[PDB]
């Protein structure tokens, strides 16, 4: 078990691209990662999820975000199942995938549902400081929407680079579209600052605690 | 903390619509529920997420899913913040909100990030049996997309009703759009029973372990 | 729990004027403070109590006494509720207010009535040596009279500066008005002194143990 | 020690009017009581506070509130000190006084300041159920104003009788004089029920959470 | 609890002549003391006992013996009760009196009868080496005879200065008046000495173990 | 050890008049007793104190008080020492004497001075209930005055019989000679009942707390 804000546990993992250390192997290059588990090789929802992830991989990579899978299966199945996707949907898998033996890493991370020994569908966003920024736990029976995660990481990068909070559904927020939110003033002094920034056209606002601006 | 497939803890909560017991009050009625926490009242990303949720309340309610929020503030602030949404954005909020004192329920469900004392942005999908079906943990700095949750509850009701699994991004899957997946065969017998079904026109398939159908 | 004569527990607090350390932040400037709690933001007796306190703040400040509020609510509510007072009673709140998360400070100090998780109406007078000089615990259902406290601190300052005790209701004592009391002689020697001070017009007296004088 | 809303401990006390059991002796009769301690007999501030209390005894008694004092002296000194008040200030004292040996009751109620062995100046308001309704701890050097206590018992009887709360400084509140406050609404339903009541002329209000009325 | 021959416990005491240390304050000046307790101020047998002690104080002082009282009462009562004696029997009290709070010293010394919290009437003779030489415990209901104690201390001083034992009722012994007793011979050698002292007119004797002489 | 108002321990003692059980043997008959220890037989101060006691035996016996002595010697020495008193001073001793082996009873009653193994000179007054009424501890070097003990038992019988207290040096008190004191009033009611009694001629008084009368 884990929470948002913790550092990703240091671990060695056997993958399809060889043995690597987490978080370090991504963090040391300044890259983030999205860790996602699925129940098993040669299962149907997962195949749809992998194929969707490969079709999206460069969008993640472009952002300095590396996708990486996990199941409790051995590497030979991982590779045979990647080959099936390449041969039947004509999409080569180029992100690496963890052969988490005996759910060792799955367990440290809370990936295994009640009563099971296999993982469901989990997603961890780990930044390049190795900090877990967000977590998703979806059941076997429901496939993910990778676009939500792409949106999530994008919002996370922008939060970081510009010191802002993103609103519901950004960049299509109902009320303010792709404008970003200013952290609410938490003191009377910070309320003074907001008032000033507004009365000189630097932010818009519905109120002192609710300020926003174009990026 | 909690893991998927566990039971929602029995608990009385003070809400803006009175004291209720969870899961019971919803379960007793056969309603499911989506519990979401946010950090505090009169904060901005939250405001956008509440507005968006209210604009979606009936799309949940039509399904027999009730929304219900949470923050560590007191009910007097909840209602005044609700009234600010009504007066300034012209949406009355008609789902209840838990005033979780001292972060009590928050803690049991592990809603509190590393080093925090208030919640971030968690979602819990709880069915009519009181079973946790899926869990999301978003940080304060990124707002949620409620449309993925609607997608998700919708996928889950359909899985339960039709005995099926749902592909990546269903009902708009890249490979099979709004077709449902059949639980992979897991015995040699069940493979026999897929092959019968295919040549027989009852299901389409990519392989014995990848069979799907229109609903 | 605490008693008169103890030092105020050293604590960091998040307020509306930022994070400060108690007692130090007031003590280091030679200032005293009056710490007062109330149950919640956007509650009625408290609003009357805050408005009365702001209308009195300069009387406290003049004496080197800084008022400071507390409730278990987050700073965003504190500030939104101060704004309501400014807008509806035209009185800006200029004393700071503590967002005591999870009643942490409330508990150290015994502010939380039997069975509750929120504070009632408590008042601590802490001097500039950080010593608690007096304590009041009033229930939710009864509002304070700030004039009694103003009277109290004034009497306390004068006790300190002139080495005297003040009588019932000073400066309108029934029997001696705004005259102050001399500490009763506690030895036969100190009785000699009183006798002398009287038989040369320096104090008045009903008896050797009951001596008083104009200030 | 003790906190508001706890029950007065069952205890036999030797007083100047005999042995009685608290709270019972008052509670059995439906009388409330105000217990106040002072440091010692034949001390000056105390003398002024006793005189003042006697001059107020009937204003308490008319309400069904009985005054009763305490110090760690013995009953022989209490009565002689009482007689000094009668002979020198022309008030007989007609409330009883506890000779609390070895500071016993004093201790349970935490009447004893840091480093002291005798009491300072505490007041306890105890209703007819035996419940501590409010507590004051004044130091030896400052005498009390009994008029605030009369105000306070008076506010408390009225709260109990009329189901209401009382504002800052009631019956002379800066905003509503001697009007009583209605318990803020704490559910969306109760807000409905305030708005009905207002337009309907049953209560006046500043806001749904701030409603008041003439008694 | 204590016995004859023990050193008086080192203790600080608050008295009517100020705070002093026992035994030291008397011992360091070579003075003995008679410590006597009584139950309470403004009680009748005690008043008779104090008045008798003041009328005798110079007889004690002359011998280098300082009288000193104790009760569990505060110093203000001690002094007010001394004033009553001065005003109604015209005898100023000039020995000091201990305000033994909470029977602290009373208890170390066994002064408190079975079932009580107050002292009865006890007397300790402490010499200038701080040694307890004799102890009397009289009940509340019976007043002392100070002449017996005066006789006792006198006999004790003489025992010390001349190396002798005093007989029953000395200086009015039935058999030998104000003659003193020689310590009985405890060896055959010491019997030889007695025989010689007699057969040269230095002691009188009824027997070798029973020898006496004029002082 | 023991304190006043405790019960004499049940104990069988070998005496010069046989084996008896204390307190019973005296109590069973309604007789009180005065127990006195002395250091040893054939010692001088003791001899004088025995002679004096015998000369007083009937003055005790007339009152229903039986004298009874103690030392750590054996009964053969007691009787021979008794016979020395008869032959040399012409008084037969007619009270019994305890041969307390190994200082056993001596120890329970704390008769043994610091560093000693034999008794000094203790007196215990024990009533017919078996209650220790007063205790004296005189050292070996000073003999007792039996006349104070006669005074004392006499005061105690009278206290018990007439419900009163006895003043300093009664029956020859400096202020009221052989008048008895009335238990001070300890309630406001009992003060009323003193004042009635005085003006009414039933008691004389110096003050309400100092009332006395002829028997």
From Swiss-Prot, chains A, B, C, D, E, F:
GO MF annotation list: peroxidase activity; thioredoxin-dependent peroxiredoxin activity
Active site: 46 (cysteine sulfenic acid (-soh) intermediate)
Classification via SUPFAM superfamilies: Thioredoxin-like (SSF52833)
Catalytic activities: a hydroperoxide + [thioredoxin]-dithiol = an alcohol + [thioredoxin]-disulfide + H2O
Enzyme Commission designation: 1.11.1.24
GO biological process, one term: cell redox homeostasis
Primary localization class, coarse: cytoplasm
Residues covered by the Thioredoxin domain: 2-158
Chain residues that bind substrate: 121
NCBIfam families linked: PRK13189.1
Protein name in UniProt: Peroxiredoxin
């Amino acid at each position: 078990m884990v929470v948002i804000g913790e550092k990703f546990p240091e671990v060695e993992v056997k993958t399809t691209h060889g043995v690597i250390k987490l978080p370090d192997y991504f963090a040391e290059q300044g890259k983030w990662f999205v860790l996602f588990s699925h129940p098993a090789d040669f299962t149907p929802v997962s195949t749809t999820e992998f194929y969707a992830m490969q079709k999206r991989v460069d969008q993640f990579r472009e952002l300095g975000v590396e996708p990486i899978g996990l199941s409790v299966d051995q590497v030979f199945s991982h590779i045979k199942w990647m080959e099936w996707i390449k041969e039947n949907l004509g999409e080569e898998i180029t992100f690496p995938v963890i052969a988490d033996d005996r759910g060792e890493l799955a367990d440290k991370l809370g990936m295994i549902p009640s009563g099971a020994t296999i993982t469901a569908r989990a997603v961890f966003i780990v930044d390049d400081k190795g900090i877990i920024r967000a977590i998703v736990y979806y059941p076997a029976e429901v496939g993910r929407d990778w676009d939500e995660i792409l949106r999530l990481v994008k919002a996370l990068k922008v939060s970081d680079e510009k010191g802002v909070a993103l609103p519901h559904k950004w960049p299509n927020n109902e009320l303010i579209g792709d404008k970003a939110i200013v952290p609410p003033a938490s003191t009377v002094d910070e309320v003074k600052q907001r008032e000033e920034a507004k009365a000189k056209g630097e932010i818009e606002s519905y109120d002192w605690w609710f300020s926003y601006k174009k990026l």
